[PDB]
Design a protein around this nucleic acid. Structure first.
Ligand code: K
Ligand code: K
Ligand code: K
Ligand code: K
Ligand code: K
Ligand code: K
Ligand code: MG
Ligand code: MG
Ligand code: MG
Ligand code: MG
Ligand code: MG
Ligand code: MG
Ligand code: MG
Ligand code: MG
Ligand code: MG
Ligand code: MG
Ligand code: MG
Ligand code: MG
Ligand code: MG
Ligand code: MG
Ligand code: MG
Ligand code: MG
Ligand code: MG
Ligand code: MG
Ligand code: MG
Ligand code: MG
Ligand code: MG
Ligand code: MG
Ligand code: MG
Ligand code: MG
Ligand code: MG
Ligand code: MG
Ligand code: MG
Ligand code: MG
Ligand code: MG
Ligand code: MG
Ligand code: MG
Ligand code: MG
Ligand code: MG
Ligand code: MG
Ligand code: MG
Ligand code: MG
Ligand code: MG
Ligand code: MG
Ligand code: MG
Ligand code: MG
Ligand code: MG
Ligand code: MG
Ligand code: MG
Ligand code: MG
Ligand code: MG
Ligand code: MG
Ligand code: MG
Ligand code: MG
Ligand code: MG
Ligand code: MG
Ligand code: MG
Ligand code: MG
Ligand code: MG
Ligand code: MG
Ligand code: MG
Ligand code: MG
Ligand code: MG
Ligand code: MG
Ligand code: MG
Ligand code: MG
Ligand code: MG
Ligand code: NA
Ligand code: NA
Lengths: 203, 258, 211
RNA sequence: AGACCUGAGUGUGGCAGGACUACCCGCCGAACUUAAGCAUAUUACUCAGCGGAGGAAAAGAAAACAACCGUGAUUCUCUCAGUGAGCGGCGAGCGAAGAGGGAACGAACUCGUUGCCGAAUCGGGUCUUACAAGGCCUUGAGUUGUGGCACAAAUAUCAU
RNA sequence: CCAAAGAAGGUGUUAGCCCAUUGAGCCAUAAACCUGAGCGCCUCAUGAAUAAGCGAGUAGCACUGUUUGGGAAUGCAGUGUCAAGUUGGCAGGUAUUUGUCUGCCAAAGUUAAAUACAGAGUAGGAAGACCGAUAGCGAACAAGUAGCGUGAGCGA
RNA sequence: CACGAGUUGUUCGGAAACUGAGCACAACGUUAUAUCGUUUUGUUAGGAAAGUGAAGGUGUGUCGGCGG
RNA sequence: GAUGCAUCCAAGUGGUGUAUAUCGCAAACUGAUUUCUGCCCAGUGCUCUGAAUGUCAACGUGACGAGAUUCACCGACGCG
RNA sequence: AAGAAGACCCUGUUGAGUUUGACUCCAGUCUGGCUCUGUGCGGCGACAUCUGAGGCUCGGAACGUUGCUUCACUUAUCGAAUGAAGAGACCAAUGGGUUGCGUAGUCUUCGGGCUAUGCACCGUCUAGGUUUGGGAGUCCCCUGUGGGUACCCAACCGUGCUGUAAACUGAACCAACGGGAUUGCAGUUCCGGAGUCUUGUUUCGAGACAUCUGCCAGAUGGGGAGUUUGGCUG
RNA sequence: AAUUACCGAAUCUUUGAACGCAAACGGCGCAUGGGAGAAGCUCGUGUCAUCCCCGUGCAUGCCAUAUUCUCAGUGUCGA
């Protein structure tokens, strides 16, 4: 169908035409706010894959995050203790930028539920992610079996707990078996399993 | 160690300008359409003193070019300006002391003050008392005017930048000896919290690189590198030379190839 | 307001830069006369509204309620194909006689490939000035693309004349369209500045000619 | 004139903010201490800090183990195993996984995509004892795509 | 004298029979819960008797940083660079280039139980080879009270 | 210590109702994290923050002058 | 001579001297007046020129090899 | 005698403040590369294909691509100013327009294009200055006073231009007026008085560099952090 | 109508996320409903100016929505 042409066009991101389209959009996004509400997704084919539908109660926002490594917020770049913990500029955040973008959106608008997000554009200083959010009070959402689950309170601020796709990515949850034994179901859960001292009644 | 005083002043706090009792920024009138194509006539209403500034200030009343009201701009008064004087600002203003003209309309050798470094910045050069710029030449090909700054440096600016004819009032202020610590106290009362000054060798080594010792001395050279971090950059910063200057004081500052 | 400035500046940046042919082809639209003729034909074969479809469907049940043993078709009357999914299928299946595409779809990647797909299947196509005008012909707010699969006997001549006109501008000019870059258009003030500069230095280097 | 794209104002109907925080999820994150000193290491992916839920949470239906006569989502327990694995100023120290016996288990489903259809979709009025998974109406939303059918636990489906 | 009741509380000394308890059973009930997926009516739903694809700034790779038992690199992060899908891709715990085999099909989502409650709460219950008023919670009592500190807090 | 009483405002002080050194709500930006930063040199904010209204037109009420 | 110097700050369209503009601002030393302030640039600092002027990274360029790897060239402050 | 687990001295594989040419590092500063990052015209090389013409060296294009670089430019970006208050053009292309027609080539899906090259449209109005044509109206009241007439068009320059060229303190808003419709006069109107236009940028300066943004890399770096600074010993 | 126990119906002052604006102020608003009103007008009854009392709405952001509400843009068109 028409999806295949849309999907393959977005795989040629380095072509002449796609760089021109992204150059215009990146310039426009530079002169907008950090959070912007959209009427329609910029990549309808990508948004639909991630769960977006053109129904009442689905909202798309474009979120901007600044690029680069994390600088440790120590006063005057002065650390204490062992020299192993002396780095200021060279450490990296253990959370990816897509997860940061989702967390900024969900924290700002508490009436919505963050579903998913995708990459739209980059720039020398900024990264743009479009976030799909769902209104839980909408009647269309509350009666749709495909999206009904998000109304339940256990999914409140799921992006703040790393439950979205981007959150699962930096948790190591894309892997199974011998590549993920120490981080399943979580790093803390495996640590508790491996470090609690067990006292059997008859030992 | 502890934070050096020079770095502590970057926070502001108790080292900021004593702005109370000041009349406000002194500027030329906005480079508007009337200035660009004709002239505007103003009347000097008063000559006033502002705390912390040696030069006198002038309140010049203009008519609003678009509305039915007055404007009453405040600029640094050149020497000889008087109340009731008519001030002409614009392209067609005559060459007279107190008038504001585009630099391209001013002859070689004319003495100017309140010069615009950039066109429309409302005057940034030759503003301290007794100071002035000297016009060296114009170049009509590139539309730039060359002037000699009060420090002796030569600078080229666009010919559309405005200058005021004359010298800044209040000259000769520094030639009177202060004679008293109390007189220095009142001088800096209107400026900022920067006096009295305590020598670095008189401080403790925890506070200053020059501090400490069983004798009051700098145990290391006082000429420090340009790349030294704040807290280390005290003394004579990136000095090209030291000692008594003999046979001519060279123009200070950075070399500009222009 | 910020949005007013940005939408004006966006237009400027789309003419100053070098536009690749895949995008520049959408600024070369069908002429006004044939655009009006194409929209008139599309309007004649507009899809039936919600009211008309409901009445037709209800009447069909009346036939079936009369004699349940016999069969009555529920197919809609002949109309143009609308919707990106359905228009794309009509092109791939090679059923569309002529495709009409709008030039202001945002995001443009929805229809950027469509002229190439129509050319690959040798299906006549045209690019017209407005997606809103395309929507008015079919009775919607906007329409990315419209395909005609068949017409009645009295409209076959108009469709054939329409196909010839759009083929002149788009299908037969494939070599030009595939290679023509756009943009690089100076502003009026820049053009006037360049014009006056040449007029100033018109005969300065005359004395350097031996003749 | 008007349209539709983008963006505003107001009316109408709602939601967020705070508390709790033992356990749980995400980030951030020390040092004392041990090494008979100490810097890698250790304490510890711990305390403190910042966020977010629930009666549990998280995980979960193989881009999994294995290398067998093969097993078969996740979680947990004994064991594997303080290990003739491994990591480590190869020092001090650190350190799991598959298999096996078990607990639990009616455990599996949805979208996107591809084909075939195509507004059959959603809200909002109104009526049926009914804010019906119902009928009728509705340009309001939606063709820049809502829904339907079939995709290995499958092999037609659609009218009667 | 009772015991299908010996059961441990109260009562002016140590109580099966002084009192209360200790059992069959009886009565009353918003909804929800369980019961030929309990059983009728109206309404609405519903079962049975031919080729194509499958998730892209994603996965990889380089550098840096961190984490891991994971060791020519176990996961992750930043930047750069960035696929395949014509027996394709990923994994197969010593790096590379080949060619054979085995398993699986990432980059979208929901999901009960078995597990935690290591300084939580609500409504109830069962206990103890524990402490016995300088003990046991700081607090058996008008206790986070009186009192102290500008305050964070401290605290009988 | 116990019991029982006492404080009366149009004009007094404060507020209603000023600006000052200053603060920091909104807005915007930043931060893994807002519990951060900017916020008087006439002055918020890429910034559409005025709901107030000269004059008119159109009705009503208090007048005026003209002729019938 | 302001796209500045000094300089705060984890960070921004952030902050201070600066409501300022060399008779100014920032950084040092000495310590009224009077009379003076000699010699030394070897050392250590600070500061200013070579276009091959040696060496110093990453990135780049080429080459052997199946490839990992390796080799050669290029390479700035700085030091000399 | 009391007041204090000597403050002197030594020991401990205990510290802390400070310093530096200690050891190991971190901010800051600087530097290179990439990126942000666009257009056009050249210059100098490299590669590729083919050739020298002397004795591996040296010299040629001409089609392409690309490593540096000059100049011109402007849309990214940066610096200022402003209540984003008047930009540029009209003075005319090396310009745009199939929402124009020709000529000559060269293509065509036969519908019509593409390359050059003309014509025509977009597309135009002005203060003032100088000098070419044209037509057309001093009078009242008493030597004085009052009112009024000495214009339009065209070309050239000029370029948006009614005021000042030694300065001493004024007032100016909420339009008159004239047309076109609906003698004169007055209503509701537009029109101009107050030029029009927009391949669009608020304006100015700079400009594809700059540390402007991120990343990688190297020097410097007691400004700062952590730690160490043997033993025997009359 | 005892008193206990339990719970379906109620009440629930000033605040506080606190949200009309503030605050060492039991302060001050804008709408819209009421109430009391010994002045004045009316025939002690009515009505009631200024003053006073009480209720409800009124923070910011976001989502949806408008019997299809009112608008802006040298955005793109179309007349
Ligand atoms: K002082
Ligand atoms: K002092
Ligand atoms: K000293
Ligand atoms: K650890
Ligand atoms: K603040
Ligand atoms: K001195
Ligand atoms: Mg530390
Ligand atoms: Mg396990
Ligand atoms: Mg275990
Ligand atoms: Mg253990
Ligand atoms: Mg401080
Ligand atoms: Mg001193
Ligand atoms: Mg001392
Ligand atoms: Mg020191
Ligand atoms: Mg001394
Ligand atoms: Mg001394
Ligand atoms: Mg359709
Ligand atoms: Mg301990
Ligand atoms: Mg130790
Ligand atoms: Mg020890
Ligand atoms: Mg120690
Ligand atoms: Mg904690
Ligand atoms: Mg459970
Ligand atoms: Mg769950
Ligand atoms: Mg399993
Ligand atoms: Mg064993
Ligand atoms: Mg460990
Ligand atoms: Mg098992
Ligand atoms: Mg097991
Ligand atoms: Mg209904
Ligand atoms: Mg679908
Ligand atoms: Mg007893
Ligand atoms: Mg019983
Ligand atoms: Mg049944
Ligand atoms: Mg897949
Ligand atoms: Mg990637
Ligand atoms: Mg570790
Ligand atoms: Mg690693
Ligand atoms: Mg690594
Ligand atoms: Mg889940
Ligand atoms: Mg027991
Ligand atoms: Mg006691
Ligand atoms: Mg006790
Ligand atoms: Mg106690
Ligand atoms: Mg008393
Ligand atoms: Mg009393
Ligand atoms: Mg300020
Ligand atoms: Mg103030
Ligand atoms: Mg304010
Ligand atoms: Mg501002
Ligand atoms: Mg400054
Ligand atoms: Mg000295
Ligand atoms: Mg002396
Ligand atoms: Mg020397
Ligand atoms: Mg020397
Ligand atoms: Mg290399
Ligand atoms: Mg002792
Ligand atoms: Mg002692
Ligand atoms: Mg010791
Ligand atoms: Mg010893
Ligand atoms: Mg100390
Ligand atoms: Mg140092
Ligand atoms: Mg130190
Ligand atoms: Mg010794
Ligand atoms: Mg309040
Ligand atoms: Mg408030
Ligand atoms: Mg418009
Ligand atoms: Na100030
Ligand atoms: Na019952």
């Amino acid at each position: 169908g028409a999806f295949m042409y849309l999907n393959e066009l977005w795989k040629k991101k380095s072509s002449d035409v796609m760089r021109f389209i992204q150059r215009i959009r990146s310039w426009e996004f530079r002169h907008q706010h950090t959070v912007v509400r959209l009427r329609r997704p910029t990549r309808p084919e990508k948004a639909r894959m991630l769960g977006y539908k053109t129904k009442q109660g689905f909202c798309v926002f474009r979120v901007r995050v600044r690029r680069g490594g994390r600088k440790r917020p120590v006063h005057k770049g002065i650390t204490y203790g062992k020299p192993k913990t002396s780095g200021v500029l060279g450490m990296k955040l253990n959370k990816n930028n897509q997860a940061v973008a989702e967390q900024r959106l969900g924290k700002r608008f508490g009436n919505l539920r963050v579903l998913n997000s995708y990459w739209v554009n980059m720039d020398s200083t900024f990264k743009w992610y479009e976030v799909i959010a769902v209104d839980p009070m909408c009647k269309t959402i509350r009666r749709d079996p495909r999206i009904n689950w998000i109304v339940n309170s256990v999914h409140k601020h799921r992006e703040q707990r790393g439950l979205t796709s981007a959150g699962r990515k930096h948790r190591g949850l894309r892997h199974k078996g011998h590549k993920a034994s120490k981080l399943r179901p979580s790093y803390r859960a495996a640590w508790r399993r491996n470090n609690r001292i067990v006292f059997l009644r008859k030992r | 160690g502890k934070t050096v005083l020079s770095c502590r002043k970057g926070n502001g706090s108790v080292y900021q300008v004593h702005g109370h009792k000041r009349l406000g920024p002194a500027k030329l009138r906005i480079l508007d359409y009337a200035e660009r194509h004709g002239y505007m006539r103003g009347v000097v209403k008063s000559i006033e003193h502002e705390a912390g500034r040696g030069a006198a200030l002038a309140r010049v009343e203009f008519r609003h070019p678009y509305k039915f009201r007055r404007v009453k701009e405040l600029m640094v008064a050149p020497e000889g300006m008087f109340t009731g004087q008519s001030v002409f600002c614009g392209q067609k203003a005559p060459l007279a002391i107190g008038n504001v003209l585009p630099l391209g309309q001013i002859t070689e050798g004319c003495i100017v003050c309140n010069v615009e470094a950039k066109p429309g910045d409302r005057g940034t050069l030759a503003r301290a008392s007794g100071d002035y710029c000297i016009i060296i030449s114009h170049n009509h090909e590139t539309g730039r005017t060359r002037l000699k700054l009060p420090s002796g440096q030569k600078k080229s600016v666009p010919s559309t930048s405005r200058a005021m004819i004359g010298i800044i009032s209040g000259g000769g202020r520094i030639e009177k000896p202060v004679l008293k610590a109390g007189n220095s106290f009142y001088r800096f009362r209107g400026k900022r919290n920067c006096w009295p000054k305590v020598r670095g060798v008189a401080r403790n080594p925890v506070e200053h690189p020059h501090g400490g010792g069983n004798h009051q001395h700098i145990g290391h050279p006082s000429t420090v590198s340009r790349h030294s971090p704040p807290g280390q950059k005290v003394g004579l910063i990136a000095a090209r030379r030291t000692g008594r200057i003999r046979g001519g004081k060279a123009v200070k500052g950075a070399w500009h190839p222009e | 307001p910020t949005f007013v400035t940005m939408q004006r500046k966006k237009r400027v940046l789309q003419r100053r830069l070098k536009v690749p042919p895949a995008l520049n082809q959408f600024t070369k639209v069908l002429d006004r006369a044939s655009r009006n003729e194409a929209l008139k034909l599309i309007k004649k074969y507009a899809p039936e509204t919600r009211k008309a479809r409901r009445e037709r469907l209800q009447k069909v049940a009346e036939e079936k309620k009369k004699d349940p043993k016999k069969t009555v078709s529920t197919k809609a009357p002949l109309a143009v194909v609308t919707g990106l999914q359905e228009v794309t299928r009509a092109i791939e299946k090679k059923q569309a006689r002529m495709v009409v595409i709008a030039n202001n779809v945002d995001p443009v990647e929805l229809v950027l490939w469509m002229p190439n797909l129509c050319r690959a299947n040798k299906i006549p196509y045209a690019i017209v000035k407005d997606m809103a005008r395309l929507g008015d012909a079919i009775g919607r707010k906007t329409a990315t693309c419209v395909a005609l699969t068949d017409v009645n006997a009295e409209d076959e001549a108009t469709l054939k004349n329409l196909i010839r006109s759009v083929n002149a501008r788009f299908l037969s000019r494939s070599d030009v369209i595939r290679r023509q870059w756009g943009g690089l258009q100076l502003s009026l003030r820049s053009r006037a500045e360049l014009r006056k500069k040449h007029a100033r230095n018109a005969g300065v280097d005359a004395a350097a000619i031996i003749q």
